[PDB]
């Protein structure tokens, strides 16, 4: 038990030569008599002795060994943010969600201590940030900044999306994507960013509109009046964004709650070139609104001429 203490000391201090002189199949998984009662692997992991960790693992150290608190060496690596140690342990089969006596996982420890880098690693290896410790608190609950909380949430949703795709779980893919911010709806009037972008008076509105669509915005989204972005753009003669909507397959004949197309609204506002653009995109001038009107029947003579030309 005198050589044991020397071995544990070699592990804590990173003394490779002394470790290998003292390490045998009989003491590789010994515990300290006092303190945390760590194994050499606990010590090497907690004090970031990468090389010692590798040699212990090569010579039979048990990644599931416990200390006085139920910690495995992964807890020690993660709590102190030693990235490389953490990955080696995981490579040699450490349980990524191992629980100590208080049901803290390695992720609890890394998040608790603001070890951002290690949390991402743990999540890539299947760490569940929803698992609760004995106080019902999850790892996200323990992240001390809102930046880490949003990152933990992002990465866990990322990995969850990949698994659901592997299983062609249409319901779950559809679920998570619905909570993406690209389709956020204004609580009262239900417009999306795409409605707001095509109505903008600022000169980057075309590039914003293109970006939103590239990132998944629904080109035919209805607001509370069932207006699409095309309706909003057409009644304002924002022709530049209407071309973007068309290129992304906007439905030219979608109907608002009055049964009106985008072309009805362009004709009502008297926007001649807009009417022309809409016709060239395949707007159907024959559609009758719920109040009984075609576009031409709502427009002035110049509008009626455009629809006739």
């Amino acid at each position: 038990e005198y050589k044991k203490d020397e071995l544990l000391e070699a592990a804590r201090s990173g003394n490779e030569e002394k470790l290998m002189a003292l390490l045998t199949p009989l003491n590789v998984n010994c515990h300290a008599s006092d303190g945390r009662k760590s194994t050499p692997l606990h010590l090497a992991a907690g004090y970031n002795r990468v090389r010692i960790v590798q040699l212990l693992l090569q010579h039979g150290a048990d990644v599931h060994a416990k200390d006085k608190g139920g910690l495995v060496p992964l807890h020690n690596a993660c709590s102190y943010g030693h990235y490389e140690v953490t990955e080696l342990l995981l490579k040699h089969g450490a349980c990524v969600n191992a629980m100590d006596l208080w049901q803290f996982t390695p992720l609890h420890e890394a998040a608790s201590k603001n070890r951002v880098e290690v949390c991402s690693l743990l999540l890539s290896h299947g760490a569940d940030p929803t698992l609760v410790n004995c106080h019902g608190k999850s790892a996200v609950d323990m992240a001390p900044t809102p930046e880490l909380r949003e990152r933990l949430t992002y990465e866990f949703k990322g990995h969850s999306l990949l698994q659901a795709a592997r299983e062609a779980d249409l319901a779950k893919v559809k679920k998570t994507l619905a909570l993406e911010i690209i389709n956020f709806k204004q609580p009262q009037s239900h417009e999306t960013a795409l409605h707001c972008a095509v109505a903008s008076l600022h000169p980057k509105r075309k590039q914003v509109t293109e970006l939103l669509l590239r990132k998944g915005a629904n080109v035919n989204e209805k607001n509370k009046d069932f207006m699409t972005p095309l309706h909003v753009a057409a009644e304002r003669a924002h022709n530049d964004v209407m071309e973007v909507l068309h290129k992304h397959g906007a439905k030219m004949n979608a109907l608002d709650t009055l049964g009106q197309t985008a072309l009805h609204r362009a004709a009502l506002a008297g926007h001649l070139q807009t009417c022309r653009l809409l016709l060239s995109y395949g707007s159907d001038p024959s559609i009758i609104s719920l109040q009984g009107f075609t576009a031409a029947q709502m427009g002035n003579e110049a509008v009626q001429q455009i629809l006739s030309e």
Partner: peptide, 8 residues
């Protein structure tokens, strides 16, 4: 509940 052996 103490902490585990190690250092940051």
């Amino acid at each position: 509940r103490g902490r585990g052996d190690g250092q940051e």
